[PDB]
Curated annotation (Swiss-Prot), chains D, E:
This is Ktr system potassium uptake protein A. Keywords: Cell membrane, Ion transport, Membrane, NAD, Potassium, Potassium transport, Transport. It comes from Bacillus subtilis (strain 168). Residues 132-212 form the RCK C-terminal domain. It comes from the Bacteria. Homodimer, tetramer (dimer of homodimer) and octamer (tetramer of homodimer). Part of the KtrAB complex formed by an octameric catalytic ring of KtrA and a membrane associated dimer of KtrB forming a potassium channel. NAD(+) binds at residues 9, 29-31, 49-50, 71-73, 96-98, 102, 118. It is found in: Cell membrane. Catalytic subunit of the KtrAB potassium uptake transporter. The 2 major potassium transporter complexes KtrAB and KtrCD confer resistance to both suddenly imposed and prolonged osmotic stress. GO terms for biological process: potassium ion transport. The gene is ktrA. GO terms for cellular component: plasma membrane. Disruption phenotype: Impaired potassium uptake.
Amino acid sequence: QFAVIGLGRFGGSICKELHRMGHEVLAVDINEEKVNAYASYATHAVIANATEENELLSLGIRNFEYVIVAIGANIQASTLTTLLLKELDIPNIWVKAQNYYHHKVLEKIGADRIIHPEKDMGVKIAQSLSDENVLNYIDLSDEYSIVELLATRKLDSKSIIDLNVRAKYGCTILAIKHHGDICLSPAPEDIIREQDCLVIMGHKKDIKRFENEGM
Amino acid sequence: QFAVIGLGRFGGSICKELHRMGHEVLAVDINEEKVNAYASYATHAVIANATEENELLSLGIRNFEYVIVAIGANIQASTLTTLLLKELDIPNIWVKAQNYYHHKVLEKIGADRIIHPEKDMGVKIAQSLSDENVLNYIDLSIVELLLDSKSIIDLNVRAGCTILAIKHHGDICLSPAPEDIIREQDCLVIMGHKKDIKRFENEGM
Amino acid sequence: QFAVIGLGRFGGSICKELHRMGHEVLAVDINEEKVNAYASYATHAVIANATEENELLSLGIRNFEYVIVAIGANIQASTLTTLLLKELDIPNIWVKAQNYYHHKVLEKIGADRIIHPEKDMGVKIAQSLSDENVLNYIDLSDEYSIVELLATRKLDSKSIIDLNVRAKYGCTILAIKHHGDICLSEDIIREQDCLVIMGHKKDIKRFENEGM
Amino acid sequence: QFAVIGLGRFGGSICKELHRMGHEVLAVDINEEKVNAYASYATHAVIANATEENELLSLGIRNFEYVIVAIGANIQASTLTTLLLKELDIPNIWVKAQNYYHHKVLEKIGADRIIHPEKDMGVKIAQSLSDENVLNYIDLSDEYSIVELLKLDSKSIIDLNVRAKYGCTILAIKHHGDICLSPAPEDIIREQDCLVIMGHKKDIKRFENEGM
Amino acid sequence: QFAVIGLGRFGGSICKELHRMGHEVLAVDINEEKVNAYASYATHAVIANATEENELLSLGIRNFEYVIVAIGANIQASTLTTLLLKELDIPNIWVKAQNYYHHKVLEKIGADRIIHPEKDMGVKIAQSLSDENVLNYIDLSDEYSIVELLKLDSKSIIDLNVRAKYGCTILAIKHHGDICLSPAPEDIIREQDCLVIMGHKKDIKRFENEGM
Amino acid sequence: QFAVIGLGRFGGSICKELHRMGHEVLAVDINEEKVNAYASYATHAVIANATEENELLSLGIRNFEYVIVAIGANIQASTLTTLLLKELDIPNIWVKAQNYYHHKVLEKIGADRIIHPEKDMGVKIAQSLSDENVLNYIDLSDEYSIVELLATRKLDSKSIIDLNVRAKYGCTILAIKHHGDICLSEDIIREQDCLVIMGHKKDIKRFENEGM
Amino acid sequence: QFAVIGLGRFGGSICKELHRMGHEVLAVDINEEKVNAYASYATHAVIANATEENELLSLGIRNFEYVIVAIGANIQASTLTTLLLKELDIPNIWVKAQNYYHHKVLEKIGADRIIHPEKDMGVKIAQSLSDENVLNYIDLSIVELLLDSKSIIDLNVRAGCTILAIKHHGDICLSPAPEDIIREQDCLVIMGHKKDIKRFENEGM
Amino acid sequence: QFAVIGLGRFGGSICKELHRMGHEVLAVDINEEKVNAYASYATHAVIANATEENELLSLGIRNFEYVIVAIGANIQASTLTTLLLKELDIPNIWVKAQNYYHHKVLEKIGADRIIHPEKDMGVKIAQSLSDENVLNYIDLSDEYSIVELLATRKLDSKSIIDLNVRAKYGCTILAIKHHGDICLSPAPEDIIREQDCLVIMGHKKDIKRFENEGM
Ligand SMILES: Nc1ncnc2c1ncn2[C@@H]1O[C@H](COP(=O)(O)OP(=O)(O)O)[C@@H](O)[C@H]1O
Ligand SMILES: Nc1ncnc2c1ncn2[C@@H]1O[C@H](COP(=O)(O)OP(=O)(O)O)[C@@H](O)[C@H]1O
Ligand SMILES: Nc1ncnc2c1ncn2[C@@H]1O[C@H](COP(=O)(O)OP(=O)(O)O)[C@@H](O)[C@H]1O
Ligand SMILES: Nc1ncnc2c1ncn2[C@@H]1O[C@H](COP(=O)(O)OP(=O)(O)O)[C@@H](O)[C@H]1O
Ligand SMILES: Nc1ncnc2c1ncn2[C@@H]1O[C@H](COP(=O)(O)OP(=O)(O)O)[C@@H](O)[C@H]1O
Ligand SMILES: Nc1ncnc2c1ncn2[C@@H]1O[C@H](COP(=O)(O)OP(=O)(O)O)[C@@H](O)[C@H]1O
Ligand SMILES: Nc1ncnc2c1ncn2[C@@H]1O[C@H](COP(=O)(O)OP(=O)(O)O)[C@@H](O)[C@H]1O
Ligand SMILES: Nc1ncnc2c1ncn2[C@@H]1O[C@H](COP(=O)(O)OP(=O)(O)O)[C@@H](O)[C@H]1O
């Protein structure tokens, strides 16, 4: 189902994770040490130069629905591989882009998805930096947001009704997380300890106010 | 409030985003072109060698609560900068790690947060690969999913997940009534057991 | 009608020749000295970074039916330029390829013709090495060929009927070149006159063997 | 009979072609991969530093009538090799020139032929660019050209007279790989039949404009 | 008992000395010549890259109670090695610091002792420069010093009283490798006999000025 | 009285210390930042290229009894400076040697003392490694030694007569150091007080073994 | 009249000497310090890259009858310069050769004289080593030699070399009379057979 | 009698010449090819690192009256060698200097003669350049010079008395060279051909005038 062609910082991580999730993954790399290191983290692992057409055929690359081209540094290799993958009619080709220029040729040679990992992680880090309290969020509208909050101290050993969040800020607490054991829909008396995960829902400004005052 | 010391693929992105969100950001880089290119995407932008102690002082680096050290490639420069920042008593120092080794010294020289961008994006991509259907998620799982013209009672999700919202036309139905129509381009927000959601995906979609 | 984007060993030569032939040519280069040096050998010459989209627009690059991308060394620049040219709907984009890899991306980003100058000149040189008599040829069939021959000592000061080629080997001499003045169709052939022969490939080859 | 000293874009092409033509060729290169890659495209292939006199002797370089020095980039290596080849009394030494300067020393150290591949390919491309539609051409003079050309359909030589109207002589017709060498006044030209035309460049170009 | 990781001006000296003192020492260096040169001045000598974890294990580095990291120039290598040594639970890790910065990371990665050889030798030289003529000295405080010193000849401790006049206590006399440990008031001091003196630095310096 | 010519890790340290001791010191360096940084740690500080004879004259270098050449890396500069200093009749020229070779030329061009800082610090470190108890020592004979010891936990809060050292091992405690204030000659010894012992080497070593 | 293109150990020495002799010399070098250092030892001194054709034209290089190409190390630069000089029709081009190979191309690109300084100085040193006694010589041998208070008749050199001169006190006795005293610090100039002179050295000295 | 320690452009030339003159020469070099190449041009040739004291002893370096240190480039090696040679009490140590600095230390470590080959050849070339006619000269005084002249053409096929040089310029022609066969003291009728070597003596200005007019 999945082949990952570059086992580096990025490709290796995709590989390890797909495998941990339970999908079958073919790990490909030109470097023998890398292939050895990923033997345990992939269904199969093979030494191959992904820029070599017969080597790609030998991997049985067409038997794959998704091929990820994760060779970062070598722009030539990356596009040459992508080029070959498009020739072999691969349904989904995802490629890591090195820079603006690399993005542009990948776009034209028919990459299905182009990833800028650092750029994307930049946004995520900035999101983290601006509200440290928020671990995760989902934007429902311009105005509404579901927010996973890490409990700052003053919120310690307090029940739902202790700070009633429906009356005060007009937000609904969706869950509590204690010990990797969750309280899915809390009763009015359920204790929130420090470092429990609050899941809160409603108006963005109301949550932000609750953060300002209850934390 | 924020200073970003390396304006590259990673640091530049952090900078541009904080600025876009409305925070004030000092952009620092050794390279003049980079500093020029980020003039518009930062409150202030200054040429500086972040490994030079007097240059850091000159930036007024202590007036900052968060300093991000985003010079990727040069492991020496990165740790030397971090080292200097810890000397100047910066409250929060976030550094991009190049490899395992780099992580280790940053850990010991008192980096407050150490980021492995590619590693982290790997996980996120694998999540995406594994279920192409989800737009956003929060692991507690709450899942934003992208059933046409069917009500909430038309498919009774509790009988074991709870539909939290519908998005039609950038107008959301926050907690839907049992007879609220879901169209095709619509943003289901679903909550509960991970396997139950996956099953709902398999069968209702 | 023509724009040449890289004025180097290759691009400059194309430019100089189109101009010498009487066509109008826009010469483009990033380097100011190159642009200065080609001022006399082009209708117009402009400093421009061909990888910069607004700079291309400013050249009025769309007013051109043929754009030649001759930037040799920089594979990135070459393909980025080609990419931009294809975006601007240029009807004919001809690019010099650096290597196999370069050829492949140019092929996919819609280059209309891809030139390997050294590769092609290799063939021509080997042709030249193999029979030092010939200078140019056109293949009509598997059997027939028009051949431009450089004359040896052996047919020096000879007329057409001195070695009658229609009888002896059965080829028709099409022209003689004496001093950049051509006898189109008893005419004396001097050494280093260009013989233009036509007919059967083997007959010509025999005439070479015997008359030269 | 032939040795090619630089297997590169240029030298490799000369080698591959001489071999394909059936001549015996010794391929030489300093780089082992290049030598391996040309094993199949040469009579013999050997690793050698062509700037090293004893290595040249070991190749049996004197047993060769033609040595091609095709190392492009390294001007020093190129001229040092040429220099050594001239010492060993090689009858024909052909060298690829990198620039004007390189040409000049090669000229003085007794290179028999000096090739500028890109320069020469420039001219050929410009010729192609000027008249696309002549599948092939041979330049006789500045003024005169033989042109292979691809309304004309179902018309004879008498019905379309070119000696009078444009002043050009149709040399041949090609119908399905079966050529009419010198057409009788009534011979039918069908679409896609190869016209061979000869005479004044402007007259041909006019005939193209009007008859096509 | 001891391993020395950098055989250089500094590390080599530590190695040679521990060996000369009779301790067993493992000498490590990446450079084969250095390892060869220290074969005679160490219990064992091994080629190893001290920044490579498996190579460290192979040395049996944990069997050592003291590891000295003496690679001067390469700050990266130095700290990476130290880092690995701290991972392997070495009880005592002594490292040569290159500069202030280097000191700081070594401090944080748990170096047990950090040496600045030139800095420390600076102090010792300045001490020598200040008072040349004290063959040897030990600094007790900023104010107090024990001094070995080389008019004084043929005079006793009673004839030259130092407890009263300068306020210093003569600790010993050395006559021909045969020492008078604590001199009786009448013991003769001959020229070139080693005076040991103790007390206030300025008092000694005054005694030097006047009695010598 | 003293000039220091290289203000680096080594020279700067000598300079700072002579100044701290109260001597007057001229600090010289080619680098302006170094000269600025040592303005506070020297009587005078001057920018000068010590390899330039007129620059040396301008410093009034002859007015000095001791010149220290501390330029480490640049062997040429170091010896050229030393050479010039010997020409100007300087009474004492002390130079830091980079390597064996450097030592040899300095020896011949009349350096009065040649220092190998790292080599010398190596010995001192090995001494320290071998017995972690001691800090400083003076060798009186083959048999006798004055030793500065750093106190362990075992003699913490003990008086002189608590472990009477004159009876038990037969050594005389010369001083105690508590907090940079010294008890020169029932006095409590706390941990990290500096013991100053004197007598037989083996007796001290025994006292170390048993009392610590 | 003379241009010297490389002001190094060799070219600088040629320059300084021609100037000292009184000829006018143009000193050329790519390095600004060298050009500065030779300002006093040349009629004119100019910064120029001698491998650049327009720079050569700008020097007015054609106004010169002799151009010396003295860039030692860089064989490429040396021959490229020589090549350009031959194009500009310079009447006399003298070049320092680096090795055998360098000699060969310079020979073919039309260098008028090719100098191997070290090789040539080798011969001269060996001459000096072999007979330490001679101050100067000319191989036809005429020998300047550095017998106290003895006349020309006191040692009859013809009975088989001819003493050409004596030097006392920077006052020379051009062709000495048979009774002319030779002192110790005196400059004998002797002529004839090489072996005869050597023998005279062996026996009279 | 002579040892040459560097067989390079300079040292090799000294070696080859001393040998050609008939003296016995020990050629030393660190490089084996150099030692092989000079086997024929020296009495003995030995591989040695001249900076290594025991290697010098092994050569029997003290048995030599003259040692020439001709390692050009490596200033360290050159001075270290010289230093060792001075320790071994060599009577004459001649060293090639690389630059001003090198000269200075060699001077102090007791080099007996210091040679700057290029500098010296510079002077000789400039002498050649300023009077091309003169091949060789000896300065007798400020005013007087013996000059070896190469016959320029107009001097062709003329006897001594044809241009009487004692009357005209008041110089005495000392010799003629035809075919490496010399006419030592020419008779008044001896023919001078082009490319014969004129040896002329007398006043510097008179010779210079004779050059101006007879050539
Ligand atoms: N032609 C190729 N075929 C297969 N794998 C390749 C090829 N070229 C490079 N790689 C592999 O791609 C991986 C890229 O990893 P890395 O340089 O860390 O990039 P990233 O920073 O994106 O992880 C390396 O493990 C490398 O061995
Ligand atoms: N010593 C330094 N001081 C300040 N900025 C630096 C220093 N070294 C590098 N930088 C800047 O940091 C940025 C690193 O970005 P980049 O090379 O893209 O790596 P990354 O992938 O981590 O973003 C560059 O803009 C670079 O100019
Ligand atoms: N980004 C660019 N835009 C426009 N012209 C360029 C750019 N990059 C290089 N060039 C020009 O293209 C030409 C390439 O010539 P060259 O490298 O000699 O190739 P060749 O020898 O094959 O013609 C140079 O004249 C250079 O100035
Ligand atoms: N000293 C040498 N002896 C023999 N072959 C050489 C030497 N130096 C370079 N070569 C070969 O000459 C070839 C030059 O080819 P290349 O650089 O592609 O130029 P071009 O593109 O003009 O052919 C290279 O394949 C190289 O291996
Ligand atoms: N990675 C490494 N592992 C082991 N030894 C090393 C490594 N890198 C350098 N060394 C050795 O450390 C020594 C450092 O010595 P040197 O450069 O003289 O510094 P110092 O003068 O301070 O001793 C060198 O001999 C070198 O061979
Ligand atoms: N020609 C010179 N004249 C005067 N000072 C010099 C000269 N060359 C170098 N220096 C100075 O000598 C010092 C050498 O210090 P450094 O290289 O750190 O040696 P170390 O670390 O052993 O003290 C530097 O401060 C440098 O500025
Ligand atoms: N391309 C060039 N154009 C002009 N001058 C040059 C060029 N390259 C080198 N030079 C100068 O020529 C001189 C060479 O001198 P040097 O290196 O001492 O060699 P040598 O021993 O032949 O004198 C230097 O002064 C150098 O700056
Ligand atoms: N330590 C050494 N002992 C002996 N010979 C040496 C040593 N170092 C260098 N040489 C030799 O000295 C010679 C110097 O030659 P070269 O570099 O041509 O100088 P030059 O230009 O003066 O001739 C070389 O042949 C080299 O092998």
